[PDB]
Curated annotation (Swiss-Prot):
Protein name: Beta-defensin 103
Disulfide bridge map: 11-40, 18-33, 23-41
Sequence similarity: Belongs to the beta-defensin family.
Keyword terms: Antibiotic, Antimicrobial, Defensin, Disulfide bond, Secreted, Signal
Part of the whole protein covered: 23 to 67 of 67
Job of this protein: Exhibits antimicrobial activity against Gram-positive bacteria S.aureus and S.pyogenes, Gram-negative bacteria P.aeruginosa and E.coli and the yeast C.albicans. Kills multiresistant S.aureus and vancomycin-resistant E.faecium. No significant hemolytic activity was observed.
GO biological process: cell chemotaxis; defense response to bacterium; defense response to Gram-negative bacterium; defense response to Gram-positive bacterium; killing by host of symbiont cells; killing of cells of another organism
Subcellular localization: Secreted
MF terms (GO), sorted A to Z: CCR6 chemokine receptor binding; chemoattractant activity
Tissue specificity comment: Highly expressed in skin and tonsils, and to a lesser extent in trachea, uterus, kidney, thymus, adenoid, pharynx and tongue. Low expression in salivary gland, bone marrow, colon, stomach, polyp and larynx. No expression in small intestine.
Domain of life: Eukaryota
Induction: By bacterial infection and by IFNG/IFN-gamma.
Gene designation per UniProt: DEFB103A
Coarse class of the protein's main subcellular location: secreted
Amino acid sequence: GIINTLQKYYCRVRGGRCAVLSCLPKEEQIGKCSTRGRKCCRRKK
């Protein structure tokens, strides 16, 4: 079928910031900003 998932570079294509443990309350998660224990957060617009 057709692929639409890309959490492997969702933050690498147009992400934002990276958290150390948990994302920021002022932003949602779009993908992994590392590999284990971290994630990517993008400020809500």
